[PDB]
Design a protein around this ligand. Structure first.
Ligand SMILES: *P(=O)(O)OC[C@H](O)CC(=O)C(=O)CC
Length: 237
């Protein structure tokens, strides 16, 4: 005490409260291991037209009532169109005011953003050290078709620096993805995992991957979340 602290970044169409509810199992284990888990809300307030999937008026009202019409950034299928400035500043401001944080945990948009923040934390928040641990749940990077490599993807130029990982990072990366996930197919999370693995010269003790059988969700099954939490707590020691 003060005990280690992790910052949790939710996914598209959630908020801090809902993410806390969805991550209750992992949070229970971390709290038992004397780790503090902080949840914050994404700043981009969505209108119905900003949804990339169908939803009726009733379900949209329900979304409004729950205060979950939120994103870290507007969705686009075209990576060069993405703008993370507001969401990034929101998290950075929070860390400035409430840090330092020993680690970070992100889901889907929150995981794309948490990965970028992991890469850049010491530049974004002067005097803040590297994270000890970064947990990337159903994450992805801002890829596009590679013109000279049909069928292959590259990171869009706007975000090349953002997803660049320096060699010899102290941070332990923990990737989590669901085998059934169709919102963010695991190929995207593995693509991002590979960037870290390469930067760490193939060291699977520093860059870890856990696949669960489920879909686009924070996993809760004992046999998956226990080893994950063990890896987090061991990095914090
Ligand atoms: P992530 O969940 O933040 O990004 C993936 C999609 O844009 C969001 C999504 O499929 C949903 O929010 C589904 C409910």
């Amino acid at each position: 005490v003060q005990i280690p602290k992790l910052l949790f970044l939710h996914g598209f169409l959630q908020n801090g409260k809902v993410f806390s509810e969805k991550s209750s199992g992992i949070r229970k284990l971390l709290k038992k291991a004397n780790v503090q888990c902080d949840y914050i809300d994404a700043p981009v307030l969505l209108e119905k037209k900003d949804l990339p999937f169908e939803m009726d008026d009733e379900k949209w009202q329900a979304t409004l009532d729950a205060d979950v019409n939120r994103a870290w950034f507007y969705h686009s299928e075209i990576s060069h169109e993405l703008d993370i400035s507001e969401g990034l500043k929101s998290v950075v401001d929070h860390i400035k005011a409430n840090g330092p944080y020993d680690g970070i945990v992100g889901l889907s948009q929150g995981a794309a953003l948490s990965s970028i923040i992991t890469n850049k934390i010491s530049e974004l928040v002067p005097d803040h050290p590297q994270f000890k641990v970064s947990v990337v749940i159903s994450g992805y990077s801002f890829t596009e078709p590679d013109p000279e490599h049909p069928g292959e993807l590259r990171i869009t130029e706007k975000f090349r620096d953002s997803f660049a990982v320096k060699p010899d990072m102290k941070t332990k990366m923990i990737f989590i993805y669901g085998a059934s996930d169709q919102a963010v197919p695991s190929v995207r999370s593995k693509y991002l995992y590979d960037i870290y693995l390469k930067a760490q010269n193939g060291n699977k003790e520093k860059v870890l991957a856990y696949e669960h059988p489920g879909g686009h969700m924070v996993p809760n099954k004992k046999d998956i979340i226990r080893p994950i939490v063990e890896q987090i707590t061991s990095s914090l020691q």
